[PDB]
Scaffold this active site. Structure first.
Site, PDB file in Angstrom:
ATOM      1  N   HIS A  40     -50.020  63.801  46.902  1.00  0.00           N
ATOM      2  CA  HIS A  40     -51.209  62.962  46.957  1.00  0.00           C
ATOM      3  C   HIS A  40     -51.477  62.270  45.617  1.00  0.00           C
ATOM      4  CE1 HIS A  40     -53.999  66.290  45.517  1.00  0.00           C
ATOM      5  NE2 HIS A  40     -54.633  65.235  45.047  1.00  0.00           N
ATOM      6  N   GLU A  52     -48.770  67.022  25.416  1.00  0.00           N
ATOM      7  CA  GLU A  52     -50.160  66.654  25.218  1.00  0.00           C
ATOM      8  C   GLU A  52     -51.066  67.863  25.039  1.00  0.00           C
ATOM      9  OE1 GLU A  52     -51.464  63.960  24.631  1.00  0.00           O
ATOM     10  OE2 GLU A  52     -50.762  62.253  25.857  1.00  0.00           O
ATOM     11  N   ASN A  54     -54.959  66.898  23.357  1.00  0.00           N
ATOM     12  CA  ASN A  54     -55.987  65.882  23.549  1.00  0.00           C
ATOM     13  C   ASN A  54     -55.321  64.617  24.106  1.00  0.00           C
ATOM     14  OD1 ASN A  54     -57.933  63.798  23.197  1.00  0.00           O
ATOM     15  ND2 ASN A  54     -59.042  65.162  21.796  1.00  0.00           N
ATOM     16  N   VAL A  57     -55.968  61.295  21.922  1.00  0.00           N
ATOM     17  CA  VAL A  57     -55.624  61.249  20.499  1.00  0.00           C
ATOM     18  C   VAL A  57     -54.135  61.520  20.375  1.00  0.00           C
ATOM     19  CG1 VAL A  57     -56.041  62.241  18.211  1.00  0.00           C
ATOM     20  CG2 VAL A  57     -57.915  62.109  19.875  1.00  0.00           C
ATOM     21  N   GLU A  62     -46.389  64.589  21.257  1.00  0.00           N
ATOM     22  CA  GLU A  62     -46.210  63.882  22.521  1.00  0.00           C
ATOM     23  C   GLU A  62     -44.797  63.334  22.687  1.00  0.00           C
ATOM     24  OE1 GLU A  62     -48.604  63.073  20.182  1.00  0.00           O
ATOM     25  OE2 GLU A  62     -50.556  63.249  21.222  1.00  0.00           O
ATOM     26  N   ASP A  84     -47.704  69.020  50.316  1.00  0.00           N
ATOM     27  CA  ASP A  84     -48.266  68.214  49.223  1.00  0.00           C
ATOM     28  C   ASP A  84     -47.465  68.456  47.927  1.00  0.00           C
ATOM     29  OD1 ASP A  84     -49.825  66.485  47.769  1.00  0.00           O
ATOM     30  OD2 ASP A  84     -51.615  67.812  47.710  1.00  0.00           O
ATOM     31  N   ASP A 171     -62.603  77.527  39.187  1.00  0.00           N
ATOM     32  CA  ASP A 171     -61.725  76.834  40.136  1.00  0.00           C
ATOM     33  C   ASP A 171     -61.051  75.656  39.431  1.00  0.00           C
ATOM     34  OD1 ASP A 171     -60.650  76.073  42.709  1.00  0.00           O
ATOM     35  OD2 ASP A 171     -62.626  75.386  43.472  1.00  0.00           O
ATOM     36  N   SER A 172     -60.037  75.095  40.089  1.00  0.00           N
ATOM     37  CA  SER A 172     -59.536  73.776  39.723  1.00  0.00           C
ATOM     38  C   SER A 172     -60.453  72.692  40.322  1.00  0.00           C
ATOM     39  CB  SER A 172     -58.099  73.638  40.213  1.00  0.00           C
ATOM     40  OG  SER A 172     -58.022  73.780  41.613  1.00  0.00           O
ATOM     41  N   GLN A 174     -61.163  67.974  40.649  1.00  0.00           N
ATOM     42  CA  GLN A 174     -60.598  66.624  40.639  1.00  0.00           C
ATOM     43  C   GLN A 174     -60.037  66.297  39.253  1.00  0.00           C
ATOM     44  OE1 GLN A 174     -63.608  67.171  42.612  1.00  0.00           O
ATOM     45  NE2 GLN A 174     -62.364  66.837  44.443  1.00  0.00           N
ATOM     46  N   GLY A 175     -58.807  65.756  39.227  1.00  0.00           N
ATOM     47  CA  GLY A 175     -58.074  65.460  38.011  1.00  0.00           C
ATOM     48  C   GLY A 175     -57.088  66.549  37.592  1.00  0.00           C
ATOM     49  N   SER A 177     -55.267  67.906  40.049  1.00  0.00           N
ATOM     50  CA  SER A 177     -54.292  67.750  41.114  1.00  0.00           C
ATOM     51  C   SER A 177     -52.903  67.535  40.559  1.00  0.00           C
ATOM     52  CB  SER A 177     -54.648  66.536  41.967  1.00  0.00           C
ATOM     53  OG  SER A 177     -55.880  66.709  42.624  1.00  0.00           O
ATOM     54  N   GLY A 178     -51.921  68.189  41.212  1.00  0.00           N
ATOM     55  CA  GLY A 178     -50.545  68.042  40.811  1.00  0.00           C
ATOM     56  C   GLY A 178     -50.088  69.022  39.743  1.00  0.00           C
TER      57      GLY A 178
HETATM   58  N1  LIG Z   1     -61.372  72.932  43.914  1.00  0.00           N
HETATM   59  C1  LIG Z   1     -60.010  72.674  44.389  1.00  0.00           C
HETATM   60  C2  LIG Z   1     -59.608  71.244  44.245  1.00  0.00           C
HETATM   61  C3  LIG Z   1     -58.658  70.842  43.323  1.00  0.00           C
HETATM   62  C4  LIG Z   1     -58.300  69.519  43.202  1.00  0.00           C
HETATM   63  C5  LIG Z   1     -58.889  68.569  43.992  1.00  0.00           C
HETATM   64  C6  LIG Z   1     -59.816  68.948  44.944  1.00  0.00           C
HETATM   65  C7  LIG Z   1     -60.173  70.276  45.076  1.00  0.00           C
HETATM   66 CA   LIG Z   2     -52.388  63.387  22.652  1.00  0.00          CA
END
Ligand SMILES: NCc1ccccc1
Ligand SMILES: [Ca+2]
Length: 223
Positions: A40, A52, A54, A57, A62, A84, A171-172, A174-175, A177-178
């Site tokens: 996704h 990486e 920061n 910066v 890097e 996914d 938790d993890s 948004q951002g 992901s992957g």
């Molecule tokens: N809270 C789990 C999650 C991770 C990444 C994107 C959406 C949801």
């Molecule tokens: Ca950097």
């Protein structure tokens, strides 16, 4: 990552940032020329950023390398998020060192109760938005298949597992992901989905990497 901690610069040496003018997803370096991420996260115009801490910066460790080829899993379904996973080939091999290193693929799947390290540059808030500059980390256990299915009726396939804390707070997000879920030194998960972040009874859902090792190896061998 919500409820995590600052990893420390270059302490997660396989973590990459995928950049298309800005950070938009994580990934994991699995050999000098290939990255694993979530399907996704696919887009064109990817620059892989290795070494990486920061992301705003230039700090001196890097390596920025353009992607030459993307390969989304043959059976990825963007509606269900089944399968996914994607592979990204780098135009040139990364220089491997203590701060830029590949992560081993699993030999065996991991079990519920195993501790794992989840990392990324995603949102650190469950309500509202704050995106960190430095890499964040979270230690979290894999949850049982039955707990995961109870949390997400009708949604958990054999290619997914849950990890985290049913009570919420960690938790993890948004951002992230992957990015990686590493257990015992092996890449067992990819940050995939959930419902919000760090909410009670809504743990993170992760792509189950051990199911994909054969596909990863044979794809690399012919691409
Ligand atoms: N809270 C789990 C999650 C991770 C990444 C994107 C959406 C949801
Ligand atoms: Ca950097």
């Amino acid at each position: 990552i919500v409820g995590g901690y600052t990893c420390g610069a270059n302490t997660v040496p396989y973590q990459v940032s995928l950049n298309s003018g800005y950070h938009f997803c994580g990934g994991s370096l699995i050999n000098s020329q290939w990255v694993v991420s979530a399907a996704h996260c696919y887009k064109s115009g990817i620059q892989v950023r290795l070494g990486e801490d920061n992301i705003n910066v230039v700090e001196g460790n890097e390596q920025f390398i353009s992607a030459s080829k993307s390969i989304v899993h043959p059976s990825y379904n963007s509606n269900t998020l089944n399968n996914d996973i994607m592979l990204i080939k780098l135009k040139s091999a990364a220089s491997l060192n203590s701060r830029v290193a590949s992560i081993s693929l699993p030999t065996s799947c991991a079990s519920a109760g195993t501790q794992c390290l989840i990392s990324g540059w995603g949102n650190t808030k469950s309500s509202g938005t704050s995106y960190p500059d430095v890499l964040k980390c979270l230690k979290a256990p894999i949850l049982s298949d039955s707990s995961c299915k109870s949390a997400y009726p009708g949604q958990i396939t054999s290619n997914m597992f849950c990890a985290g804390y049913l009570e919420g707070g960690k938790d993890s997000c948004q951002g992230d992901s992957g990015g990686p879920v590493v257990c015992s030194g092996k890449l067992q998960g990819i940050v995939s989905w959930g419902s919000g972040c760090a909410q009670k009874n809504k743990p993170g859902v992760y792509t189950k990497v051990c199911n994909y090792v054969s596909w990863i190896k044979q794809t690399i061998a012919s691409n």
